[PDB]
């Protein structure tokens, strides 16, 4: 699953 | 649906001074078409934190200010010396991109596997990344 | 039936490219189909003696098409902001068989490109942009 | 116009 470093 | 691809090579990858949490930024590129949206790739050669210190992290980032909502699917992969795709990692769905929003894989590939010369992923110490994106929403 | 797609390619240390007239820099393959593969070919020091003062850029069909292929293409250089500059397009559509190339012998003057004042080699990087629109059958 | 290196 792709992730992010911000909300 | 706007489709575009970018090939990016990092020279002397195993010598990169970037420590954990620091980023190597690609050149800014463009999806073209009507919007001419601007994007860039970001690599954490030693991951972002201690959880992913063993991995290379790879993120797609939307640089420009979009006129409307942006949704995009993406796929990252490495090109070996023969130019063949390998160790691909892709989104199983589209993700929403606002300006400055990043989406990618915190654990894209293990550093140990990448720097192992038997795998042929660093010919002449060059890391070549291939990014394929489909912008579904404007 | 028109399929549109773009490909970008950053060549590091472009001024150090030891290639001479006739020598080729080849991109990786690209597509989107997913079976129809294309590639870019660059002559950094020109293709022949007529284009000795220019860089040459060509689009090449690599795969074997199962039907007739006609494509329009546009080449450009991206500046540091990712904006397309020095664009040059085919205007018309061209037929592509396997191994066939179409492009511009004189895409850009080598003196304009190599002059730092023009800012098209940021950090000695040449970022090439290609947009293709193709129809099969 | 565009050119080719092939017939």
CSV table of N, CA, C and O in Angstrom, one decimal, chain C residues 40-107:
chain,number,residue,atom,x,y,z
C,40,UNK,N,13.6,6.9,-27.7
C,40,UNK,CA,14.2,8.2,-28.2
C,40,UNK,C,15.7,8.0,-28.5
C,40,UNK,O,16.4,7.3,-27.7
C,41,UNK,N,16.2,8.5,-29.6
C,41,UNK,CA,17.6,8.5,-29.9
C,41,UNK,C,18.1,9.9,-30.1
C,41,UNK,O,17.4,10.8,-30.7
C,42,UNK,N,19.2,10.2,-29.5
C,42,UNK,CA,19.8,11.5,-29.5
C,42,UNK,C,21.2,11.4,-30.1
C,42,UNK,O,22.0,10.6,-29.8
C,43,UNK,N,21.5,12.4,-31.0
C,43,UNK,CA,22.8,12.6,-31.6
C,43,UNK,C,23.4,13.9,-30.9
C,43,UNK,O,23.1,15.0,-31.4
C,44,UNK,N,24.1,13.8,-29.9
C,44,UNK,CA,24.6,15.0,-29.2
C,44,UNK,C,25.4,15.9,-30.0
C,44,UNK,O,25.3,17.1,-29.9
C,45,UNK,N,26.2,15.4,-30.9
C,45,UNK,CA,27.1,16.1,-31.8
C,45,UNK,C,26.6,16.1,-33.2
C,45,UNK,O,27.4,16.2,-34.2
C,46,UNK,N,25.3,16.0,-33.4
C,46,UNK,CA,24.8,16.0,-34.8
C,46,UNK,C,24.7,14.6,-35.4
C,46,UNK,O,25.5,13.7,-35.1
C,47,UNK,N,23.8,14.4,-36.4
C,47,UNK,CA,23.7,13.1,-37.1
C,47,UNK,C,24.7,13.1,-38.2
C,47,UNK,O,25.5,12.1,-38.3
C,48,UNK,N,24.7,14.0,-39.1
C,48,UNK,CA,25.7,14.1,-40.2
C,48,UNK,C,26.4,15.4,-40.2
C,48,UNK,O,26.4,16.2,-39.2
C,49,UNK,N,27.1,15.7,-41.3
C,49,UNK,CA,27.9,17.0,-41.4
C,49,UNK,C,27.0,18.2,-41.6
C,49,UNK,O,27.4,19.3,-41.2
C,50,UNK,N,25.8,18.0,-42.2
C,50,UNK,CA,24.9,19.1,-42.4
C,50,UNK,C,24.4,19.6,-41.0
C,50,UNK,O,24.3,20.8,-40.8
C,51,UNK,N,24.1,18.7,-40.1
C,51,UNK,CA,23.7,19.0,-38.8
C,51,UNK,C,24.8,18.9,-37.7
C,51,UNK,O,24.6,18.6,-36.6
C,52,UNK,N,26.0,19.2,-38.2
C,52,UNK,CA,27.2,19.2,-37.2
C,52,UNK,C,27.0,20.2,-36.1
C,52,UNK,O,27.5,19.9,-35.0
C,53,UNK,N,26.4,21.3,-36.4
C,53,UNK,CA,26.2,22.4,-35.4
C,53,UNK,C,25.0,22.2,-34.5
C,53,UNK,O,24.7,23.0,-33.7
C,54,UNK,N,24.3,21.0,-34.6
C,54,UNK,CA,23.0,20.8,-34.0
C,54,UNK,C,23.0,19.5,-33.2
C,54,UNK,O,23.9,18.7,-33.4
C,55,UNK,N,22.0,19.4,-32.3
C,55,UNK,CA,21.7,18.1,-31.7
C,55,UNK,C,20.5,17.5,-32.4
C,55,UNK,O,19.5,18.3,-32.7
C,56,UNK,N,20.6,16.3,-32.7
C,56,UNK,CA,19.5,15.6,-33.4
C,56,UNK,C,18.7,14.7,-32.4
C,56,UNK,O,19.2,14.1,-31.5
C,57,UNK,N,17.4,14.6,-32.6
C,57,UNK,CA,16.5,13.9,-31.8
C,57,UNK,C,15.4,13.2,-32.6
C,57,UNK,O,14.8,13.8,-33.5
C,58,UNK,N,15.3,11.9,-32.3
C,58,UNK,CA,14.4,11.0,-33.1
C,58,UNK,C,13.6,10.2,-32.2
C,58,UNK,O,14.0,9.7,-31.1
C,59,UNK,N,12.3,9.9,-32.6
C,59,UNK,CA,11.4,9.0,-32.0
C,59,UNK,C,11.4,7.7,-32.8
C,59,UNK,O,11.3,7.7,-34.1
C,60,UNK,N,11.6,6.5,-32.2
C,60,UNK,CA,11.8,5.2,-32.8
C,60,UNK,C,10.7,4.3,-32.3
C,60,UNK,O,10.5,4.2,-31.1
C,61,UNK,N,10.1,3.5,-33.2
C,61,UNK,CA,9.2,2.4,-32.9
C,61,UNK,C,10.0,1.2,-32.7
C,61,UNK,O,10.7,0.7,-33.7
C,62,UNK,N,10.0,0.5,-31.6
C,62,UNK,CA,10.8,-0.6,-31.2
C,62,UNK,C,10.1,-1.9,-31.5
C,62,UNK,O,10.7,-2.8,-32.0
C,63,UNK,N,8.9,-2.0,-31.0
C,63,UNK,CA,8.2,-3.3,-31.0
C,63,UNK,C,7.6,-3.5,-32.5
C,63,UNK,O,7.7,-2.7,-33.3
C,64,UNK,N,7.2,-4.8,-32.7
C,64,UNK,CA,6.6,-5.2,-33.9
C,64,UNK,C,5.1,-5.0,-33.9
C,64,UNK,O,4.4,-5.7,-33.1
C,65,UNK,N,4.5,-4.0,-34.6
C,65,UNK,CA,3.1,-3.7,-34.5
C,65,UNK,C,2.3,-4.8,-35.2
C,65,UNK,O,2.7,-5.2,-36.3
C,66,UNK,N,1.1,-5.1,-34.7
C,66,UNK,CA,0.2,-6.0,-35.3
C,66,UNK,C,-0.7,-5.3,-36.3
C,66,UNK,O,-1.5,-6.0,-37.0
C,67,UNK,N,-0.7,-4.0,-36.3
C,67,UNK,CA,-1.5,-3.2,-37.3
C,67,UNK,C,-0.6,-2.0,-37.7
C,67,UNK,O,0.4,-1.7,-37.2
C,68,UNK,N,-1.2,-1.3,-38.7
C,68,UNK,CA,-0.5,-0.1,-39.1
C,68,UNK,C,-0.5,1.0,-38.1
C,68,UNK,O,-1.5,1.2,-37.4
C,69,UNK,N,0.6,1.7,-37.9
C,69,UNK,CA,0.8,2.7,-36.8
C,69,UNK,C,1.1,4.0,-37.4
C,69,UNK,O,2.0,4.1,-38.2
C,70,UNK,N,0.3,5.1,-37.1
C,70,UNK,CA,0.6,6.4,-37.5
C,70,UNK,C,0.6,7.3,-36.2
C,70,UNK,O,-0.4,7.2,-35.4
C,71,UNK,N,1.6,8.1,-36.0
C,71,UNK,CA,1.8,8.8,-34.8
C,71,UNK,C,2.2,10.3,-35.1
C,71,UNK,O,3.0,10.5,-36.0
C,72,UNK,N,1.7,11.2,-34.3
C,72,UNK,CA,2.2,12.5,-34.2
C,72,UNK,C,3.1,12.6,-32.9
C,72,UNK,O,2.9,11.9,-31.9
C,73,UNK,N,4.1,13.5,-33.0
C,73,UNK,CA,5.0,13.6,-31.8
C,73,UNK,C,5.5,15.0,-31.7
C,73,UNK,O,5.4,15.8,-32.6
C,74,UNK,N,5.9,15.4,-30.5
C,74,UNK,CA,6.4,16.7,-30.1
C,74,UNK,C,7.6,16.5,-29.1
C,74,UNK,O,7.4,15.8,-28.1
C,75,UNK,N,8.7,17.1,-29.5
C,75,UNK,CA,9.9,17.1,-28.6
C,75,UNK,C,10.0,18.5,-28.0
C,75,UNK,O,9.7,19.5,-28.6
C,76,UNK,N,10.5,18.5,-26.7
C,76,UNK,CA,10.8,19.7,-26.1
C,76,UNK,C,11.9,19.5,-25.0
C,76,UNK,O,12.1,18.3,-24.6
C,77,UNK,N,12.4,20.6,-24.5
C,77,UNK,CA,13.4,20.5,-23.4
C,77,UNK,C,12.7,21.2,-22.2
C,77,UNK,O,12.0,22.2,-22.3
C,78,UNK,N,12.9,20.6,-21.0
C,78,UNK,CA,12.3,21.1,-19.8
C,78,UNK,C,13.4,21.9,-19.1
C,78,UNK,O,14.5,21.5,-18.9
C,79,UNK,N,13.0,23.1,-18.6
C,79,UNK,CA,13.9,23.9,-17.8
C,79,UNK,C,13.8,23.4,-16.4
C,79,UNK,O,13.1,22.5,-16.0
C,80,UNK,N,14.5,24.1,-15.5
C,80,UNK,CA,14.6,23.7,-14.1
C,80,UNK,C,13.2,23.7,-13.4
C,80,UNK,O,12.9,23.0,-12.4
C,81,UNK,N,12.3,24.6,-13.9
C,81,UNK,CA,10.9,24.6,-13.4
C,81,UNK,C,10.0,23.6,-14.0
C,81,UNK,O,8.8,23.5,-13.7
C,82,UNK,N,10.5,22.7,-14.9
C,82,UNK,CA,9.7,21.7,-15.6
C,82,UNK,C,8.9,22.2,-16.7
C,82,UNK,O,8.1,21.4,-17.2
C,83,UNK,N,9.1,23.4,-17.2
C,83,UNK,CA,8.4,24.0,-18.3
C,83,UNK,C,9.0,23.6,-19.6
C,83,UNK,O,10.2,23.6,-19.8
C,84,UNK,N,8.1,23.4,-20.6
C,84,UNK,CA,8.6,23.0,-21.9
C,84,UNK,C,9.1,24.2,-22.7
C,84,UNK,O,8.5,25.2,-22.7
C,85,UNK,N,10.3,24.0,-23.2
C,85,UNK,CA,11.0,25.0,-24.0
C,85,UNK,C,11.5,24.4,-25.3
C,85,UNK,O,11.8,23.2,-25.3
C,86,UNK,N,11.8,25.3,-26.2
C,86,UNK,CA,12.4,24.9,-27.5
C,86,UNK,C,11.6,23.7,-28.2
C,86,UNK,O,12.2,22.8,-28.7
C,87,UNK,N,10.3,23.8,-28.1
C,87,UNK,CA,9.4,22.7,-28.6
C,87,UNK,C,9.5,22.7,-30.1
C,87,UNK,O,9.7,23.7,-30.8
C,88,UNK,N,9.4,21.4,-30.6
C,88,UNK,CA,9.4,21.2,-32.1
C,88,UNK,C,8.5,20.0,-32.3
C,88,UNK,O,8.8,18.9,-31.8
C,89,UNK,N,7.4,20.1,-33.1
C,89,UNK,CA,6.5,19.1,-33.3
C,89,UNK,C,6.4,18.7,-34.8
C,89,UNK,O,6.7,19.5,-35.7
C,90,UNK,N,5.9,17.5,-35.0
C,90,UNK,CA,5.9,17.0,-36.4
C,90,UNK,C,4.8,17.6,-37.2
C,90,UNK,O,4.8,17.5,-38.4
C,91,UNK,N,3.8,18.3,-36.6
C,91,UNK,CA,2.7,18.9,-37.2
C,91,UNK,C,1.7,17.9,-37.8
C,91,UNK,O,0.5,17.9,-37.6
C,92,UNK,N,2.3,17.0,-38.6
C,92,UNK,CA,1.5,16.0,-39.3
C,92,UNK,C,1.9,14.6,-38.7
C,92,UNK,O,2.8,14.5,-37.9
C,93,UNK,N,1.0,13.6,-38.9
C,93,UNK,CA,1.2,12.3,-38.5
C,93,UNK,C,2.1,11.5,-39.5
C,93,UNK,O,2.0,11.7,-40.7
C,94,UNK,N,2.9,10.6,-38.9
C,94,UNK,CA,3.8,9.8,-39.7
C,94,UNK,C,3.6,8.3,-39.5
C,94,UNK,O,3.2,7.9,-38.4
C,95,UNK,N,3.8,7.5,-40.5
C,95,UNK,CA,3.6,6.1,-40.4
C,95,UNK,C,4.9,5.5,-39.8
C,95,UNK,O,6.0,5.9,-40.2
C,96,UNK,N,4.7,4.6,-38.8
C,96,UNK,CA,5.8,3.9,-38.1
C,96,UNK,C,5.8,2.4,-38.3
C,96,UNK,O,4.8,1.8,-38.0
C,97,UNK,N,6.8,1.9,-38.9
C,97,UNK,CA,7.0,0.4,-38.9
C,97,UNK,C,8.1,0.1,-37.8
C,97,UNK,O,8.7,1.1,-37.3
C,98,UNK,N,8.3,-1.1,-37.5
C,98,UNK,CA,9.3,-1.5,-36.5
C,98,UNK,C,10.7,-1.0,-37.0
C,98,UNK,O,11.0,-1.2,-38.2
C,99,UNK,N,11.4,-0.4,-36.1
C,99,UNK,CA,12.7,0.2,-36.5
C,99,UNK,C,12.7,1.5,-37.2
C,99,UNK,O,13.8,2.1,-37.4
C,100,UNK,N,11.5,2.0,-37.6
C,100,UNK,CA,11.4,3.3,-38.3
C,100,UNK,C,11.6,4.4,-37.3
C,100,UNK,O,11.0,4.4,-36.1
C,101,UNK,N,12.3,5.5,-37.6
C,101,UNK,CA,12.4,6.6,-36.8
C,101,UNK,C,12.0,7.9,-37.6
C,101,UNK,O,12.0,8.0,-38.8
C,102,UNK,N,11.5,8.9,-36.8
C,102,UNK,CA,11.1,10.2,-37.3
C,102,UNK,C,11.6,11.2,-36.3
C,102,UNK,O,11.4,10.9,-35.1
C,103,UNK,N,12.1,12.3,-36.7
C,103,UNK,CA,12.5,13.3,-35.8
C,103,UNK,C,13.0,14.6,-36.5
C,103,UNK,O,12.6,14.9,-37.6
C,104,UNK,N,14.0,15.2,-35.9
C,104,UNK,CA,14.6,16.5,-36.4
C,104,UNK,C,16.1,16.4,-36.4
C,104,UNK,O,16.7,16.4,-35.3
C,105,UNK,N,16.7,16.3,-37.5
C,105,UNK,CA,18.1,16.4,-37.7
C,105,UNK,C,18.7,17.6,-36.9
C,105,UNK,O,19.7,17.5,-36.2
C,106,UNK,N,18.0,18.8,-37.0
C,106,UNK,CA,18.4,20.0,-36.4
C,106,UNK,C,17.3,20.3,-35.3
C,106,UNK,O,16.5,21.2,-35.6
C,107,UNK,N,17.4,19.6,-34.2
C,107,UNK,CA,16.4,19.9,-33.2
C,107,UNK,C,16.7,21.2,-32.5
C,107,UNK,O,15.9,22.1,-32.3
